[PDB]
Amino acid sequence: ALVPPGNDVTTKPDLYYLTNAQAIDSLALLPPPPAVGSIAFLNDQAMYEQGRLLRNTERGKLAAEDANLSAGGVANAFSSAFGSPITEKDAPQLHKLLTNMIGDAGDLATRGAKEKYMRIRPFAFYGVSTCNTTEQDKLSKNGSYPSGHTSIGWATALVLAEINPQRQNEILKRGYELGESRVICGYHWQSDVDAARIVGSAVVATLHTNPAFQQQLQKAKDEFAKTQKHHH
Amino acid sequence: ALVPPGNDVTTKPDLYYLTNAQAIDSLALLPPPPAVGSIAFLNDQAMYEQGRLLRNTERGKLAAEDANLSAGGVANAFSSAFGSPITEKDAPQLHKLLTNMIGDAGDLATRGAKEKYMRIRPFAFYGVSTCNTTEQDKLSKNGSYPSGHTSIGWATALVLAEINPQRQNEILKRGYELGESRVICGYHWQSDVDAARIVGSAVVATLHTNPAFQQQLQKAKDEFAKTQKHHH
Amino acid sequence: ALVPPGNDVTTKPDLYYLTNAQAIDSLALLPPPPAVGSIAFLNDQAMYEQGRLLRNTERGKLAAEDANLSAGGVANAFSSAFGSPITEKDAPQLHKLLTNMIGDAGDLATRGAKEKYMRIRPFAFYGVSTCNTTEQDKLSKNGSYPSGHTSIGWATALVLAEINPQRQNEILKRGYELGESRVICGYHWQSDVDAARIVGSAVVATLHTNPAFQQQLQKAKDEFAKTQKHHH
Amino acid sequence: ALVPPGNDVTTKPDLYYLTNAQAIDSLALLPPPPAVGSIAFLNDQAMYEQGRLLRNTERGKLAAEDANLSAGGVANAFSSAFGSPITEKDAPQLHKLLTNMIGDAGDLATRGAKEKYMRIRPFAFYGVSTCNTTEQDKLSKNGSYPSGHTSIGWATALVLAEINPQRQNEILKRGYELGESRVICGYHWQSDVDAARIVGSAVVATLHTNPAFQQQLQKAKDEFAKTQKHHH
Amino acid sequence: ALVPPGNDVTTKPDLYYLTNAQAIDSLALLPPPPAVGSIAFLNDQAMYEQGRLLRNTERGKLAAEDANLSAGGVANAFSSAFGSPITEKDAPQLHKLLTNMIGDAGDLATRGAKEKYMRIRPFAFYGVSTCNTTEQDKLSKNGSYPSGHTSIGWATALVLAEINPQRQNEILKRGYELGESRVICGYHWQSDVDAARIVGSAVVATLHTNPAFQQQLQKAKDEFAKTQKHHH
Amino acid sequence: ALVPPGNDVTTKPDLYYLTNAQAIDSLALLPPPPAVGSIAFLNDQAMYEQGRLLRNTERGKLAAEDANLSAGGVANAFSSAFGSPITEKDAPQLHKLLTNMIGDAGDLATRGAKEKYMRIRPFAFYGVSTCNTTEQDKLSKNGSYPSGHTSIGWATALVLAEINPQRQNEILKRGYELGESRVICGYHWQSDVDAARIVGSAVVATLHTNPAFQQQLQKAKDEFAKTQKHHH
């Protein structure tokens, strides 16, 4: 399947490295989302309910904070796991790298499947708010599958793990948990998040073929090497 | 968690690029497998039954053939998706690359979780054979979660997609289907395969930090560029 | 959808009143059967298990006897419910009527859906025998949905109820139970039987438009009126 | 079981052909409705949820319109499927026929089971409105099983199919979909609708034994034959 | 496990016979409550829904009345089952006996498990009221497992059955139904009530070892013997 | 309901303290067992499968050993939990006490419900052996609900806890686990065991009203007091 019309490197070069033609064929790659009446969807509902009961815990507080993140806030959200600030102030080359792949992982890697299924999101299915909003706030009710935010989270984790392998496990756990936070908060079904990690991993392979990404990745690594020297 | 004792680059340099210390912490990263009595496991059983009914179709024939693959046969199993033979004969540098990461993706990336849960495999749970064996053949009954073979399949797909981005979607679909073949054949539960793609993607990030992998990857790309020239 | 190729009144005028062109479009009318992984199929399995536990009861004995019936034996199987023998000996016009619609209800009304889904039957799904057979006996393993026998049973009940309205409820219960006997015995899933009653009822409407059926139905009614006179 | 007290041909000869004594014994014929805690009811809930998500589609719009139909509006609701207007204006004999069996199919054929189980309807179970009402509108909350409207729909379809066999499949599909519209809108559980088609088919057999129905049916057929001549 | 801090005979000698050290180790004895995503919890939800539909029946009226009972009202709630008034007026020794074990059965026997799991109660899980309250009334939302009230109910039943064995079955049924009333009203999950009867039975064994309980029990029996003489 | 015909103190005074008239009305007290198609039974099956996977663990070994116990072996099976040998050699009065209530707890307390439902046992439902038998050994296939052995186990635990309150929690855990061993081994469904603890607790109340039991219980306590003196 061809990717549906949309933005890419030719329209937003600061948010995408890749063209529409280079997008992961998410529609062809991913299975369909669980249908109502499937055991798989019943499990999605179980994870929704589990998540809902976690909202009033420390993990729930983290989930609400994670759910407040825009696509652009994902990079900085890895700071503690990464071991140093991922900010425009402290790590401009790294922050530029991660910001510039937001569109590739969040949009291009998800668009085909997103637009085909236009899956209803949990909060909308139940007719309630999410963990970090009331009904005075407005969120898109559909396009749940796969999760763009989660795809960005996982893709970002994989790139960050390559830059700082000494904390790869902390980084990967953090990337994983960004996805789970969206399940806890009612933004996405578990299956949206599961599917997102597939396409999120796929787009990172594509990005490794892209000269601009390769260059910027090296700059981020060079920058990190200096950050390490000054810390030690 | 520390990776359990086992082989790595120091014992089998032809099958691993990475050391035990560089292994993905699969125990910490992955959730536990579905427990008996969970909706998640009921879905695993649904996928097992679905798979079982697919055994007598063309897709089932492919599943049985895929299930015959050893870890070393995975590389060549991508040939049609890749668009050219992945063999020692035709693409020695590529075949060497993919073979040398078998241990990293199949063993190191799965070992912690595998040994902790020692999960019973579907055929053993049901007391039956798999789609490609009778009970005269003997298979390990446990260590199901996550699937080592599937981790190799997905990691290999991600690397191959980077080498030949023009067929990234065919490659990724093939890598995905190697996992699903194991579900169809009764070797693994769906959740084993899902979990395997997480760690399979994670190890590819680690591999990108490894000088030997980086060098061999470039050799594979150089080789592929020549393969393209001679085909065109 | 057009009915698949097969027999009709032009090839077997003793077993069908209707032509292929007059067949109920079972493929278009019926929903698909429950898929593995659906709650609907889980219920089919519940009814299978319920049925299995009923096999060693009086109702189970009746189910095994009902399961021994060929399409041609259905007419006579209504005798007790009807209140008098439905035999070639005692009620030739009635027996002729009911026999001559076997193909219409059993084949024409089911063929499209049967051949499209080729659904696996319960005993085959579980790899076991039915309640009235061992594995030395051989039955078709597929084409479960909808049940031809059940369609004949229900269509026959509706026709019989019209002929003897004084025992319509006994007749209808009997027709219903012929379907349930097949669920108890493992020949069909509950949903096969449910679907069969839809098309079974539909074909009876078609039959009422057919001159030969209309004539033979009247002969059966005339015959029954005489049977009543001689009994009273 | 005897039919509970109520109207019949002796009290409302314009809405029933049949007497209370001629009613289908719905209590004896039908199984009980799914109990809370059964897999069958879990499936009813799945179909309710599926239906709910369909409310904002073209099929949902049709469902809301179908749900607006009173028993008397069912006849006309078949017009497009039938191929010509089923109205008092254009087809008075046909409209009279179908109107006069409303009580037989909607009431007599359902009353025993309806009054025994007094089953709670979906919207009432969930404490919400239906797809075509707000809570300012008031509907009966119980007597869900079986669906009277659906029984009328299916009985009407079977009669209409006999009158116009050339469009029997369109007619039958329409009759089927009237039932499904009630599931989509939250008026009835799937099982209410399934059960309704059983008794709906049963009552049509009884109606064929009734002189007044037979006469009026012939008038409807004669009328239709003239309608065909003037169209062609 | 040690019982968590709290009241016992040393602080409230009118409500407990036993010390903290004599408490049933409810945490060690009971399994954990069903987790969200378990079949066991799905059944708890089924019983909740079943209960909810029973609220508008005679049994529901009894459930609401039972749900109004405080721990101190349990004794008197057995009067009809016991065959004579269990009141301070009519049976002071009996009423004293049963009141004085409220803490032992309601608190000591449940505290360890209660405080460990702090399980959310049904009404709180669903965000609704119970059968006998509106949201203007306030109830604790957690500590559901096991049910203290049910433990008191069952322990009280076992003691009462010993005092009046001629009505042991009526008494035991009543004690059982006090638990079920809490399920019907939405105060507790079925599993809370099931677990409560385990610890409720356990504490009665402990109470039989306690001199003060033994003495008061004998006084209650002596009193009952006089009650029987005056009735006869 | 009256207890069905059978043995009691008048026929087997060494195995029962109580008469048929003193039996717990198990049919009236207990709910019916889960029906096939209920969520409750699906959970029973989950516990069966969970149990089956535990058979090859240390807990499974204990389960098989527990499953080897006859009713008469239950008393001695508490020895480790009790803290001293419960044998005819070492504690004749105690062993006599516990043996003499086998019929009361195992038979009288279960008979009504057992004979009414004649519930099929797990191993028979699945057509397999239990954890401690092959098919050369023969076990009763029905009468599963409630578990007589489990009722004896729990009743015995409650009596033992009264005799040695210092180890009440170890004793109660042991009694509980005797029930769970039967679930693990495939002798009983979880619900059989749950129900057994209800009637097991009930019969202990009745036993406390019986002079012979009271006397023998005191002898067991006197004996235990001497056992304690000689140990210390």
Smallest Cα distance from C37 to chain A, Å: 5
Residues of B in contact with E38 (CB under 8 A): 35, 37-39
Q: Can you tell me the distance from the alpha carbon of A105 to that of A114, in angstroms, rounded to the nearest whole number?
A: 13
Q: Which of B38, B193, E168 is nearest to F199 (CA)?
A: E168
Residue ranges of alpha helices (H) inside chain C are 26-29, 39-54, 58-67, 74-77, 79-82, 92-99, 102-103, 111-117, 122-126, 148-163, 168-185, 190-207, 211-231
Q: Are D63 and C208 in contact (CB under 8 A)?
A: no
* Contacts A–E by Cβ distance under 8 A: 12
In sequence order, what are the beta bridge partners of B38? E38
| DSSP character at residue C107 | I
- The question of whether F121 is a catalytic residue gets the answer no
Q: Thinking of the domain E34-231, which architecture would CATH place it in?
A: Up-down Bundle (1.20)
Q: Can you tell me the distance from the alpha carbon of D153 to that of D30, in angstroms, rounded to the nearest whole number?
A: 18
Chains in contact with D, where contact requires at least 3 CB pairs less than 8 Å apart: A, C, E, F
Which of F39, F205, F209 is opposite residue E46, by nearest beta carbon?
F39
Experimental approach taken: X-ray
Instruction: Pick the residue from chain C with its C-alpha nearest to D198.
Output: C197
Q: Can you tell me the distance from the alpha carbon of E121 to that of E99, in angstroms, rounded to the nearest whole number?
A: 25
Q: Are E27 and E119 in contact (CB under 8 A)?
A: no
At residue A37, what is the residue type?
G
The yes/no answer on whether domain D35-231 falls in CATH 3.50.50.60 is no
Two tokens at C85? 């023998």
Two tokens at C218? 């009247």
Give me the DSSP letters along D115-172: HHH-PPPHHHHHT---TT--TTS----S--SS-HHHHHHHHHHHHHHHH-GGGHHHHH
Q: Are C40 and C191 in contact (CB under 8 A)?
A: yes
Helix (H, G, I), strand (E, B) or coil at A6: coil
Q: Can you tell me the distance from the alpha carbon of D39 to that of D43, in angstroms, rounded to the nearest whole number?
A: 6
Q: At what angle do helices F168-185 and F148-163 cross, to 10 degrees?
A: 170
In sequence order, what are the beta bridge partners of F38? D38
Which fold is adopted by the domain C20-231?
Vanadium-containing Chloroperoxidase; domain 1 (1.20.144)
Residue among A95, A119, A149, A197 flagged as catalytic: A149
Q: Are B97 and B216 in contact (CB under 8 A)?
A: yes
Residue among D149, D167, D174, D197 flagged as catalytic: D149
Q: Are B197 and A159 in contact (CB under 8 A)?
A: no
Helix (H, G, I), strand (E, B) or coil at A104: helix
Chains in contact with F, where contact requires at least 3 CB pairs less than 8 Å apart: B, C, D, E
Q: At what angle do helices A58-67 and A168-185 cross, to 10 degrees?
A: 90
> E-strand spans in B81-202?
none
| Phi, psi at A75, each rounded to 5° | -50, -55
- The question of whether F232 is a catalytic residue gets the answer no
Going by C-beta distance under 8 Å and a sequence separation of 6 or more, which residues neighbour residue A58? none
At residue D85, what is the residue type?
P
Interchain pair A36, D43: CB under 8 A: no
Residue ranges of alpha helices (H) inside chain A are 26-29, 39-54, 58-67, 74-77, 79-82, 92-99, 102-103, 111-117, 122-126, 148-163, 168-185, 190-207, 211-231
Give the count of beta carbons closer than 10 Å to the beta carbon of residue B128. Answer: 13
Q: Is D33 left (phi over 0), alpha (psi -120 to 50) or beta?
A: beta
Going by C-beta distance under 8 Å and a sequence separation of 6 or more, which residues neighbour residue D57? none
Instruction: Pick the residue from chain E with its C-alpha nearest to A39.
Output: E37
From residue E62, give the alpha-carbon distance in Å to each of B135, B205, E131, E147. 60, 64, 11, 18
- What is the helix (H) or strand (E) element at residue D40, kind and residue range? helix D39-54
| E84 reaches F (C-beta below 8 A) | no
Q: Can you tell me the distance from the alpha carbon of B159 to that of B88, in angstroms, rounded to the nearest whole number?
A: 17
Give the count of beta carbons closer than 10 Å to the beta carbon of residue D50. Answer: 16
| DSSP character at residue A108 | I
Torsion of CA A219, A225, A229, A230, to 10 degrees: 40
Interchain pair B206, A162: CB under 8 A: yes
Two tokens at F216? 């023998």
DSSP collapsed to 3 states, chain E: CCCCCCCCCCCCCCCCCCCHHHCCCHHHHCCCCCCCCEHHHHHHHHHHHHHHHHCCCHHHHHHHHHHCCCHHHHHHHCHHHHCCCCCCCCCHHHHHHHHCCHHHHHHHCCHHHHHHHCCCCHHHHHCCCCCCCCCCCCCCCCCCCCCHHHHHHHHHHHHHHHHCHHHHHHHHHHHHHHHHHHHHHCCCCHHHHHHHHHHHHHHHHHHCCCHHHHHHHHHHHHHHHHHHHHHC
Cα angle: B9, vertex B12, B13; to 5 degrees: 55
Q: Can you tell me the distance from the alpha carbon of F155 to that of A155, in angstroms, rounded to the nearest whole number?
A: 60
Residue identified by tokens 């078949």 is D78
Cα angle: D150, vertex D152, D156; to 5 degrees: 120
Residue B56 half-sphere exposure toward CB, CA atoms < 13 A: 8
Smallest Cα distance from E45 to chain B, Å: 14
Residues of F in contact with E203 (CB under 8 A): none
| Phi, psi at C179, each rounded to 5° | -60, -50
Q: Can you tell me the distance from the alpha carbon of B43 to that of A35, in angstroms, rounded to the nearest whole number?
A: 13
Helix (H, G, I), strand (E, B) or coil at C193: helix
| Residue among C36, C144, C189 with most chain B CBs within 10 A, to mutate | C36
Q: Which of B47, B187, B180 is nearest to B131 (CA)?
A: B187
> Catalytic residues of C, which ones?
149, 182, 188, 192
Give me the DSSP letters along chain F: -PPPS---TTT-TTT-SS-GGGS--HHHHSPPPPPTTBHHHHHHHHHHHHHHHHTTSHHHHHHHHHHT--GGGHHHHTHHHHTS--STTT-HHHHHHHHTTHHIIIIITTHHHHHHH-PPPHHHHHT---TT--TTS----S--SS-HHHHHHHHHHHHHHHH-GGGHHHHHHHHHHHHHHHHHHTSS-HHHHHHHHHHHHHHHHHHTT-HHHHHHHHHHHHHHHHHHHHH-
Going by C-beta distance under 8 Å and a sequence separation of 6 or more, which residues neighbour residue D162? C205, C206, C208, C209, D217
Going by C-beta distance under 8 Å and a sequence separation of 6 or more, which residues neighbour residue B228? none
Give the count of beta carbons closer than 10 Å to the beta carbon of residue F83. Answer: 17
- Pairs from F130-138 (Cβ < 8 Å, separation ≥ 24): F130/F67, F130/F185, F130/F186, F130/F187, F131/F52, F131/F55, F131/F60, F131/F63, F131/F64, F131/F67, F131/F184, F131/F185, F131/F186, F132/F64, F132/F65, F132/F67, F132/F68, F132/F185
The distance of Cα F6 from the centroid of its chain, to the nearest Å, equals: 18
Instruction: Pick the residue from chain E with its C-alpha nearest to F205.
Output: E162
- What is the helix (H) or strand (E) element at residue D176, kind and residue range? helix D168-185
Q: Can you tell me the distance from the alpha carbon of E97 to that of E87, in angstroms, rounded to the nearest whole number?
A: 11
CATH for the F33-231 domain, from 1.20.144.10, 3.60.15.10, 1.10.357.10, 3.40.1440.10: 1.20.144.10
Residue identified by tokens 């589609």 is D57
| B56 reaches C (C-beta below 8 A) | no
Helix (H, G, I), strand (E, B) or coil at D77: helix
The domain B37-231: what is its CATH number? 1.20.144.10
SS3 helix, strand, coil % of chain B, rounded to 5? 65, 0, 35
From residue E193, give the alpha-carbon distance in Å to each of A19, E16, E145, E148, E181. 60, 21, 8, 9, 10
Q: Are D67 and D199 in contact (CB under 8 A)?
A: no
| D53 reaches A (C-beta below 8 A) | yes
In sequence order, what are the beta bridge partners of A219? none
Give me the DSSP letters along B29-77: HSPPPPPTTBHHHHHHHHHHHHHHHHTTSHHHHHHHHHHT--GGGHHHH
Q: Are A47 and A190 in contact (CB under 8 A)?
A: yes
| C120 reaches B (C-beta below 8 A) | yes
Interchain pair B42, E38: CB under 8 A: no
Q: Which of E75, E46, E142, D57 is nearest to F34 (CA)?
A: E46
- The question of whether D192 is a catalytic residue gets the answer yes
At residue F20, what is the residue type?
N
In sequence order, what are the beta bridge partners of E38? B38
* Contacts A–C by Cβ distance under 8 A: 14
Helix (H, G, I), strand (E, B) or coil at A38: strand
Q: Can you tell me the distance from the alpha carbon of D174 to that of D197, in angstroms, rounded to the nearest whole number?
A: 13
Q: Can you tell me the distance from the alpha carbon of A205 to that of B197, in angstroms, rounded to the nearest whole number?
A: 14
Q: Can you tell me the distance from the alpha carbon of A200 to that of A149, in angstroms, rounded to the nearest whole number?
A: 10
Q: Which of D176, D164, D178 is nearest to D68 (CA)?
A: D178
Q: Can you tell me the distance from the alpha carbon of C168 to that of C172, in angstroms, rounded to the nearest whole number?
A: 6
Q: Can you tell me the distance from the alpha carbon of F193 to that of F176, in angstroms, rounded to the nearest whole number?
A: 9
Helix (H, G, I), strand (E, B) or coil at D38: strand
Q: Are F17 and F9 in contact (CB under 8 A)?
A: yes
| F31 reaches D (C-beta below 8 A) | no
| Phi, psi at F179, each rounded to 5° | -60, -50
Q: Is the peptide bond before F211 cis (omega within 30 degrees of 0)?
A: no
Give the count of beta carbons closer than 10 Å to the beta carbon of residue C216. Answer: 20
| C225 reaches D (C-beta below 8 A) | no
Q: Are A131 and A63 in contact (CB under 8 A)?
A: yes
Helix (H, G, I), strand (E, B) or coil at C38: strand
Q: Can you tell me the distance from the alpha carbon of A191 to that of B79, in angstroms, rounded to the nearest whole number?
A: 30
- Largest alpha-carbon pair distance within chain D? 57
Residue C231 half-sphere exposure toward CB, CA atoms < 13 A: 10
Q: Are B163 and B220 in contact (CB under 8 A)?
A: yes
From residue C37, give the alpha-carbon distance in Å to each of B46, B195, C12, D190. 5, 20, 40, 19
The distance of Cα F46 from the centroid of its chain, to the nearest Å, equals: 22
Q: Is C83 left (phi over 0), alpha (psi -120 to 50) or beta?
A: left
The distance of Cα B177 from the centroid of its chain, to the nearest Å, equals: 10
DSSP collapsed to 3 states, F130-184: CCCCCCCCCCCCCCCCCCHHHHHHHHHHHHHHHHCHHHHHHHHHHHHHHHHHHHH
Q: At what angle do helices B148-163 and B92-99 cross, to 10 degrees?
A: 140
Two tokens at E32? 């954990």
| E39 reaches A (C-beta below 8 A) | no
Q: Are A142 and A120 in contact (CB under 8 A)?
A: yes
First to last CA, chain D: 50
The distance of Cα C71 from the centroid of its chain, to the nearest Å, equals: 7
- Largest alpha-carbon pair distance within chain F? 57
Going by C-beta distance under 8 Å and a sequence separation of 6 or more, which residues neighbour residue F54? F60, F63, F184
Q: Is A220 left (phi over 0), alpha (psi -120 to 50) or beta?
A: alpha
Which of A22, A29, A161 is opposite residue B176, by nearest beta carbon?
A29
Helix (H, G, I), strand (E, B) or coil at C94: helix
